[PDB]
Design a protein around this ligand. Structure first.
Ligand SMILES: CCCCCCCC/C=C\CCCCCCCC(=O)OC[C@H](O)CO
Ligand SMILES: CCCCCCCC/C=C\CCCCCCCC(=O)OC[C@H](O)CO
Ligand SMILES: *C\C=C(C)/C=C/C=C(C)/C=C/C1=C(C)CCCC1(C)C
Ligand SMILES: CCCCCCCC/C=C\CCCCCCCC(=O)O
Ligand SMILES: CCCCCCCC/C=C\CCCCCCCC(=O)O
Ligand SMILES: CCCCCCCC/C=C\CCCCCCCC(=O)O
Ligand SMILES: CCCCCCCC/C=C\CCCCCCCC(=O)O
Ligand SMILES: [Cl-]
Length: 262
Protein backbone atom coordinates (compact mmCIF):
# COMPACT_ATOMS: atom_id res chain seq x y z
CA UNK A 1 0.00 0.00 0.00
CA UNK A 2 3.00 2.25 0.63
CA UNK A 3 4.48 1.35 -2.78
CA UNK A 4 3.31 2.55 -6.17
CA UNK A 5 2.60 -0.95 -7.51
CA UNK A 6 -0.66 -0.89 -5.51
CA UNK A 7 -1.88 2.33 -7.16
CA UNK A 8 -2.49 1.05 -10.70
CA UNK A 9 -4.37 -1.49 -12.75
CA UNK A 10 -2.22 -3.37 -15.26
CA UNK A 11 -2.89 -4.48 -18.80
CA UNK A 12 -2.40 -8.17 -19.50
CA UNK A 13 0.84 -7.28 -21.27
CA UNK A 14 2.28 -5.23 -18.41
CA UNK A 15 1.33 -7.84 -15.81
CA UNK A 16 2.60 -10.81 -17.81
CA UNK A 17 5.87 -9.07 -18.67
CA UNK A 18 6.52 -8.40 -14.97
CA UNK A 19 5.68 -12.02 -14.16
CA UNK A 20 7.96 -13.27 -16.93
CA UNK A 21 10.82 -11.07 -15.71
CA UNK A 22 10.61 -12.44 -12.17
CA UNK A 23 10.30 -16.07 -13.32
CA UNK A 24 13.17 -15.67 -15.80
CA UNK A 25 15.26 -14.29 -12.95
CA UNK A 26 14.45 -17.35 -10.85
CA UNK A 27 15.53 -19.60 -13.72
CA UNK A 28 18.80 -17.77 -14.36
CA UNK A 29 19.85 -17.73 -10.71
CA UNK A 30 19.17 -21.41 -10.03
CA UNK A 31 20.87 -22.45 -13.27
CA UNK A 32 23.96 -20.47 -12.25
CA UNK A 33 23.81 -22.09 -8.79
CA UNK A 34 24.44 -25.46 -10.43
CA UNK A 35 27.39 -23.98 -12.33
CA UNK A 36 28.99 -22.53 -9.19
CA UNK A 37 28.36 -25.80 -7.33
CA UNK A 38 30.06 -27.95 -9.97
CA UNK A 39 33.09 -25.69 -10.48
CA UNK A 40 33.86 -25.29 -6.76
CA UNK A 41 35.92 -28.49 -6.94
CA UNK A 42 38.32 -26.77 -9.37
CA UNK A 43 38.95 -24.04 -6.77
CA UNK A 44 41.82 -24.13 -4.30
CA UNK A 45 40.78 -24.41 -0.63
CA UNK A 46 42.07 -20.87 -0.05
CA UNK A 47 39.42 -19.46 -2.41
CA UNK A 48 36.70 -22.13 -2.28
CA UNK A 49 34.59 -20.06 0.12
CA UNK A 50 34.24 -17.39 -2.59
CA UNK A 51 32.40 -19.73 -4.96
CA UNK A 52 30.42 -21.05 -1.99
CA UNK A 53 29.20 -17.51 -1.30
CA UNK A 54 28.00 -17.32 -4.91
CA UNK A 55 25.85 -20.41 -4.35
CA UNK A 56 24.34 -18.69 -1.31
CA UNK A 57 23.66 -15.53 -3.32
CA UNK A 58 21.95 -17.48 -6.12
CA UNK A 59 19.57 -19.28 -3.75
CA UNK A 60 18.95 -16.19 -1.63
CA UNK A 61 18.17 -14.02 -4.66
CA UNK A 62 16.35 -16.86 -6.41
CA UNK A 63 14.03 -17.52 -3.47
CA UNK A 64 13.04 -13.85 -3.14
CA UNK A 65 12.46 -13.52 -6.89
CA UNK A 66 10.34 -16.67 -6.72
CA UNK A 67 8.51 -15.21 -3.71
CA UNK A 68 7.87 -11.94 -5.56
CA UNK A 69 6.55 -13.84 -8.59
CA UNK A 70 3.96 -15.74 -6.54
CA UNK A 71 2.95 -12.68 -4.51
CA UNK A 72 2.55 -10.83 -7.81
CA UNK A 73 0.05 -13.39 -9.11
CA UNK A 74 -1.55 -13.70 -5.66
CA UNK A 75 -2.22 -9.96 -5.42
CA UNK A 76 -3.96 -9.39 -8.76
CA UNK A 77 -6.79 -10.87 -10.82
CA UNK A 78 -7.85 -10.22 -14.41
CA UNK A 79 -11.19 -8.43 -13.95
CA UNK A 80 -12.96 -6.51 -16.72
CA UNK A 81 -10.01 -6.44 -19.08
CA UNK A 82 -7.24 -5.58 -16.63
CA UNK A 83 -5.35 -6.98 -13.66
CA UNK A 84 -6.68 -5.17 -10.53
CA UNK A 85 -5.36 -5.39 -6.96
CA UNK A 86 -7.19 -8.00 -4.87
CA UNK A 87 -4.92 -8.68 -1.86
CA UNK A 88 -2.18 -6.87 0.06
CA UNK A 89 0.59 -9.34 -0.75
CA UNK A 90 3.08 -7.55 -3.04
CA UNK A 91 5.83 -5.20 -1.87
CA UNK A 92 9.40 -4.45 -2.92
CA UNK A 93 10.51 -4.31 0.72
CA UNK A 94 11.40 -8.00 0.59
CA UNK A 95 14.16 -7.13 -1.90
CA UNK A 96 15.68 -4.69 0.71
CA UNK A 97 15.68 -7.16 3.61
CA UNK A 98 17.25 -9.72 1.27
CA UNK A 99 20.06 -7.28 0.45
CA UNK A 100 20.95 -7.31 4.15
CA UNK A 101 22.18 -10.87 3.50
CA UNK A 102 23.28 -10.88 -0.15
CA UNK A 103 25.34 -7.66 -0.24
CA UNK A 104 27.64 -8.91 2.58
CA UNK A 105 28.12 -12.15 0.66
CA UNK A 106 29.00 -10.25 -2.52
CA UNK A 107 31.49 -8.04 -0.68
CA UNK A 108 33.02 -10.99 1.19
CA UNK A 109 33.88 -13.08 -1.91
CA UNK A 110 35.57 -9.95 -3.34
CA UNK A 111 37.86 -9.57 -0.32
CA UNK A 112 38.67 -13.29 -0.39
CA UNK A 113 39.88 -13.24 -4.02
CA UNK A 114 41.81 -10.01 -3.26
CA UNK A 115 44.15 -12.11 -0.95
CA UNK A 116 43.10 -10.32 2.24
CA UNK A 117 43.44 -12.25 5.48
CA UNK A 118 43.44 -12.08 9.25
CA UNK A 119 42.88 -8.75 10.94
CA UNK A 120 42.48 -6.75 7.73
CA UNK A 121 39.80 -9.00 6.24
CA UNK A 122 37.86 -8.95 9.51
CA UNK A 123 38.32 -5.20 9.97
CA UNK A 124 37.59 -4.34 6.34
CA UNK A 125 34.58 -6.65 6.14
CA UNK A 126 33.05 -5.18 9.31
CA UNK A 127 33.18 -1.59 8.07
CA UNK A 128 31.94 -2.59 4.61
CA UNK A 129 28.99 -4.51 6.09
CA UNK A 130 28.14 -1.71 8.53
CA UNK A 131 28.17 0.83 5.69
CA UNK A 132 26.10 -1.45 3.44
CA UNK A 133 23.52 -2.07 6.16
CA UNK A 134 23.28 1.66 6.77
CA UNK A 135 22.71 2.10 3.05
CA UNK A 136 19.98 -0.55 2.94
CA UNK A 137 18.15 0.42 6.13
CA UNK A 138 17.91 4.11 5.21
CA UNK A 139 16.89 3.12 1.69
CA UNK A 140 14.26 0.79 3.13
CA UNK A 141 12.76 3.55 5.28
CA UNK A 142 12.88 5.77 2.20
CA UNK A 143 10.81 3.59 -0.12
CA UNK A 144 8.09 3.43 2.55
CA UNK A 145 7.32 7.04 1.52
CA UNK A 146 7.47 6.68 -2.27
CA UNK A 147 3.69 7.25 -2.44
CA UNK A 148 2.82 9.51 0.49
CA UNK A 149 5.94 11.68 0.86
CA UNK A 150 8.38 11.78 -2.06
CA UNK A 151 10.40 14.49 -0.31
CA UNK A 152 11.18 12.09 2.54
CA UNK A 153 12.15 9.40 0.02
CA UNK A 154 14.65 11.85 -1.47
CA UNK A 155 16.15 12.72 1.92
CA UNK A 156 16.50 9.11 3.03
CA UNK A 157 17.98 8.36 -0.39
CA UNK A 158 20.50 11.16 0.13
CA UNK A 159 21.53 9.64 3.46
CA UNK A 160 21.67 6.20 1.85
CA UNK A 161 23.83 7.45 -1.03
CA UNK A 162 26.38 8.81 1.46
CA UNK A 163 26.88 5.30 2.87
CA UNK A 164 27.03 4.04 -0.73
CA UNK A 165 29.79 6.51 -1.62
CA UNK A 166 31.81 5.69 1.50
CA UNK A 167 31.32 1.97 0.85
CA UNK A 168 32.68 2.27 -2.73
CA UNK A 169 35.69 4.28 -1.59
CA UNK A 170 36.71 1.50 0.81
CA UNK A 171 36.16 -1.17 -1.86
CA UNK A 172 38.08 0.80 -4.47
CA UNK A 173 40.91 1.66 -2.09
CA UNK A 174 41.49 -1.97 -1.11
CA UNK A 175 41.28 -3.17 -4.72
CA UNK A 176 43.86 -0.68 -5.97
CA UNK A 177 46.16 -1.13 -2.95
CA UNK A 178 46.14 -4.95 -3.26
CA UNK A 179 45.82 -5.81 -6.96
CA UNK A 180 49.59 -6.39 -7.06
CA UNK A 181 49.18 -9.45 -4.81
CA UNK A 182 46.86 -11.18 -7.29
CA UNK A 183 48.07 -14.14 -9.33
CA UNK A 184 47.53 -15.48 -12.83
CA UNK A 185 47.19 -12.01 -14.32
CA UNK A 186 43.99 -11.42 -12.34
CA UNK A 187 45.36 -8.06 -11.17
CA UNK A 188 43.86 -6.71 -14.41
CA UNK A 189 40.62 -8.69 -14.13
CA UNK A 190 39.80 -7.37 -10.65
CA UNK A 191 39.77 -3.82 -12.04
CA UNK A 192 37.00 -4.78 -14.47
CA UNK A 193 35.02 -6.27 -11.57
CA UNK A 194 35.19 -2.94 -9.74
CA UNK A 195 33.71 -1.11 -12.73
CA UNK A 196 31.07 -3.80 -13.22
CA UNK A 197 30.12 -3.19 -9.58
CA UNK A 198 29.97 0.59 -10.03
CA UNK A 199 27.67 0.18 -13.03
CA UNK A 200 25.44 -2.62 -11.73
CA UNK A 201 25.03 -1.33 -8.17
CA UNK A 202 24.10 2.16 -9.40
CA UNK A 203 21.05 0.81 -11.26
CA UNK A 204 19.36 0.18 -7.90
CA UNK A 205 19.14 3.85 -6.81
CA UNK A 206 17.83 4.66 -10.29
CA UNK A 207 15.05 2.11 -9.83
CA UNK A 208 14.60 3.59 -6.34
CA UNK A 209 13.81 6.97 -7.92
CA UNK A 210 11.25 5.76 -10.51
CA UNK A 211 8.33 6.88 -8.29
CA UNK A 212 9.69 10.44 -8.52
CA UNK A 213 9.95 10.74 -12.32
CA UNK A 214 7.72 7.98 -13.76
CA UNK A 215 4.84 7.42 -11.27
CA UNK A 216 2.66 5.30 -13.56
CA UNK A 217 2.12 1.66 -14.48
CA UNK A 218 4.89 1.89 -17.10
CA UNK A 219 7.29 3.03 -14.38
CA UNK A 220 6.42 -0.09 -12.40
CA UNK A 221 7.48 -2.18 -15.40
CA UNK A 222 10.65 -0.12 -15.90
CA UNK A 223 11.67 -0.52 -12.25
CA UNK A 224 11.31 -4.30 -12.44
CA UNK A 225 13.26 -4.23 -15.71
CA UNK A 226 16.06 -2.28 -14.03
CA UNK A 227 15.98 -4.61 -11.01
CA UNK A 228 16.28 -7.58 -13.39
CA UNK A 229 19.28 -6.08 -15.21
CA UNK A 230 20.95 -5.11 -11.93
CA UNK A 231 20.33 -8.49 -10.29
CA UNK A 232 21.77 -10.44 -13.22
CA UNK A 233 24.78 -8.11 -13.44
CA UNK A 234 25.54 -7.64 -9.73
CA UNK A 235 24.93 -11.30 -8.78
CA UNK A 236 25.34 -13.65 -11.75
CA UNK A 237 27.85 -11.94 -14.06
CA UNK A 238 29.73 -10.64 -11.01
CA UNK A 239 29.84 -14.14 -9.55
CA UNK A 240 31.19 -15.57 -12.81
CA UNK A 241 34.09 -13.10 -12.78
CA UNK A 242 34.83 -13.82 -9.12
CA UNK A 243 34.86 -17.55 -9.86
CA UNK A 244 37.11 -17.05 -12.89
CA UNK A 245 39.51 -15.10 -10.67
CA UNK A 246 39.31 -17.76 -7.96
CA UNK A 247 40.07 -20.50 -10.51
CA UNK A 248 42.84 -18.58 -12.29
CA UNK A 249 44.62 -17.80 -9.01
CA UNK A 250 44.09 -21.39 -7.85
CA UNK A 251 45.90 -22.68 -10.93
CA UNK A 252 48.74 -20.16 -10.65
CA UNK A 253 49.11 -21.25 -7.01
CA UNK A 254 49.61 -24.91 -7.96
CA UNK A 255 46.11 -26.36 -7.48
CA UNK A 256 46.06 -29.21 -10.00
CA UNK A 257 42.25 -29.51 -10.39
CA UNK A 258 42.26 -25.82 -11.29
CA UNK A 259 45.09 -26.25 -13.79
CA UNK A 260 43.31 -29.27 -15.26
CA UNK A 261 40.07 -27.28 -15.54
CA UNK A 262 41.69 -24.32 -17.31
C1 LIG B 1 28.24 8.59 8.14
C2 LIG B 1 28.97 8.09 6.90
C3 LIG B 1 30.17 7.56 7.01
C4 LIG B 1 30.84 7.45 8.38
C5 LIG B 1 32.28 6.97 8.20
C6 LIG B 1 33.14 7.45 9.37
C7 LIG B 1 34.13 6.35 9.77
C8 LIG B 1 35.05 6.00 8.61
C9 LIG B 1 34.88 4.52 8.25
C10 LIG B 1 36.04 4.06 7.37
C11 LIG B 1 36.78 2.89 8.03
O1 LIG B 1 36.85 2.82 9.21
O2 LIG B 1 37.38 1.90 7.23
C12 LIG B 1 38.34 2.40 6.34
C13 LIG B 1 39.43 1.37 6.07
O3 LIG B 1 39.69 1.32 4.69
C14 LIG B 1 39.03 -0.02 6.56
O4 LIG B 1 40.15 -0.86 6.53
C1 LIG C 1 24.24 12.36 -1.67
C2 LIG C 1 24.97 13.60 -2.20
C3 LIG C 1 26.47 13.38 -2.08
C4 LIG C 1 27.04 12.95 -3.43
C5 LIG C 1 28.54 12.66 -3.28
C6 LIG C 1 29.20 12.65 -4.66
C7 LIG C 1 30.72 12.58 -4.48
C8 LIG C 1 31.25 11.29 -5.10
C9 LIG C 1 32.62 10.98 -4.49
C10 LIG C 1 33.19 9.80 -4.64
C11 LIG C 1 32.51 8.69 -5.44
C12 LIG C 1 33.56 7.65 -5.84
C13 LIG C 1 33.29 6.31 -5.17
C14 LIG C 1 34.61 5.57 -4.94
C15 LIG C 1 35.34 5.37 -6.27
C16 LIG C 1 36.68 4.68 -6.04
C17 LIG C 1 37.56 5.57 -5.16
C18 LIG C 1 39.02 5.53 -5.62
O1 LIG C 1 39.30 5.17 -6.71
O2 LIG C 1 40.03 5.94 -4.75
C19 LIG C 1 41.00 4.95 -4.51
C20 LIG C 1 42.38 5.53 -4.82
O3 LIG C 1 42.69 5.30 -6.17
C21 LIG C 1 43.44 4.85 -3.95
O4 LIG C 1 43.76 3.60 -4.50
C1 LIG D 1 21.70 -7.54 -5.28
C2 LIG D 1 22.95 -6.83 -5.06
C3 LIG D 1 23.14 -5.57 -4.64
C4 LIG D 1 24.54 -5.06 -4.50
C5 LIG D 1 22.04 -4.63 -4.31
C6 LIG D 1 22.43 -3.38 -4.08
C7 LIG D 1 21.59 -2.26 -3.69
C8 LIG D 1 22.01 -0.99 -3.65
C9 LIG D 1 23.41 -0.62 -4.03
C10 LIG D 1 21.08 0.06 -3.23
C11 LIG D 1 21.43 1.35 -3.18
C12 LIG D 1 20.55 2.45 -2.74
C13 LIG D 1 21.04 3.69 -2.77
C14 LIG D 1 22.45 3.96 -3.22
C15 LIG D 1 20.24 4.95 -2.48
C16 LIG D 1 18.76 4.67 -2.69
C17 LIG D 1 18.41 3.45 -1.84
C18 LIG D 1 19.12 2.19 -2.33
C19 LIG D 1 19.02 1.21 -1.17
C20 LIG D 1 18.36 1.60 -3.51
C1 LIG E 1 21.04 -28.13 -14.62
C2 LIG E 1 19.73 -27.71 -13.96
C3 LIG E 1 19.46 -26.23 -14.18
C4 LIG E 1 18.49 -25.66 -13.14
C5 LIG E 1 17.13 -25.38 -13.75
C6 LIG E 1 16.29 -24.48 -12.85
C7 LIG E 1 14.81 -24.81 -12.98
C8 LIG E 1 13.92 -23.58 -12.82
C9 LIG E 1 12.49 -23.99 -13.10
C10 LIG E 1 11.40 -23.00 -13.16
C11 LIG E 1 11.35 -21.82 -12.21
C12 LIG E 1 10.17 -22.00 -11.26
C13 LIG E 1 9.33 -20.74 -11.07
C14 LIG E 1 7.84 -21.05 -11.17
C15 LIG E 1 6.98 -20.16 -10.27
C16 LIG E 1 6.26 -19.09 -11.08
C17 LIG E 1 5.25 -18.33 -10.23
C18 LIG E 1 4.10 -17.86 -11.10
O1 LIG E 1 4.19 -16.79 -11.75
O2 LIG E 1 3.05 -18.52 -11.18
C1 LIG F 1 28.45 -6.01 13.28
C2 LIG F 1 28.80 -6.50 11.88
C3 LIG F 1 29.94 -7.51 11.94
C4 LIG F 1 30.28 -8.05 10.55
C5 LIG F 1 31.40 -9.08 10.65
C6 LIG F 1 31.46 -9.96 9.41
C7 LIG F 1 32.13 -11.28 9.74
C8 LIG F 1 32.82 -11.88 8.53
C9 LIG F 1 34.28 -11.51 8.52
C10 LIG F 1 35.21 -12.30 7.70
C11 LIG F 1 35.31 -13.79 7.93
C12 LIG F 1 35.13 -14.52 6.60
C13 LIG F 1 35.06 -16.03 6.83
C14 LIG F 1 35.68 -16.78 5.66
C15 LIG F 1 37.18 -16.91 5.85
C16 LIG F 1 37.81 -17.61 4.65
C17 LIG F 1 39.12 -18.29 5.04
C18 LIG F 1 39.38 -19.45 4.11
O1 LIG F 1 39.15 -19.34 2.89
O2 LIG F 1 39.84 -20.52 4.55
C1 LIG G 1 21.24 7.57 9.91
C2 LIG G 1 21.69 8.90 9.35
C3 LIG G 1 20.85 10.09 9.52
C4 LIG G 1 19.35 9.98 9.35
C5 LIG G 1 18.76 11.37 9.09
C6 LIG G 1 17.51 11.31 8.23
C7 LIG G 1 16.22 11.42 9.05
C8 LIG G 1 15.09 11.96 8.18
C9 LIG G 1 13.83 12.19 8.99
C10 LIG G 1 12.74 12.81 8.13
C11 LIG G 1 11.45 12.86 8.92
O1 LIG G 1 10.94 11.81 9.37
O2 LIG G 1 10.87 13.95 9.12
C1 LIG H 1 19.04 9.22 -4.71
C2 LIG H 1 19.86 10.24 -3.93
C3 LIG H 1 19.10 11.53 -3.66
C4 LIG H 1 19.86 12.75 -4.19
C5 LIG H 1 19.63 13.99 -3.33
C6 LIG H 1 18.17 14.42 -3.28
C7 LIG H 1 18.06 15.78 -2.61
C8 LIG H 1 16.73 16.48 -2.88
C9 LIG H 1 16.71 17.05 -4.28
C10 LIG H 1 15.87 18.21 -4.59
C11 LIG H 1 14.75 18.63 -3.66
C12 LIG H 1 13.61 19.22 -4.48
C13 LIG H 1 12.26 18.60 -4.13
C14 LIG H 1 11.47 19.50 -3.19
CL1 LIG I 1 19.10 -10.12 -3.09
Amino acid sequence: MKNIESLFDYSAGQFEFIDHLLTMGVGVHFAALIFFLVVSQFVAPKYRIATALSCIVMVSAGLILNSQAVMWTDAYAYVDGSYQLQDLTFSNGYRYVNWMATIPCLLLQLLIVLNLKGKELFSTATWLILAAWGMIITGYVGQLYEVDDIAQLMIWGAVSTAFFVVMNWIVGTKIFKNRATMLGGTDSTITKVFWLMMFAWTLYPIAYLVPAFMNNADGVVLRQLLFTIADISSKVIYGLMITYIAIQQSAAAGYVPAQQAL
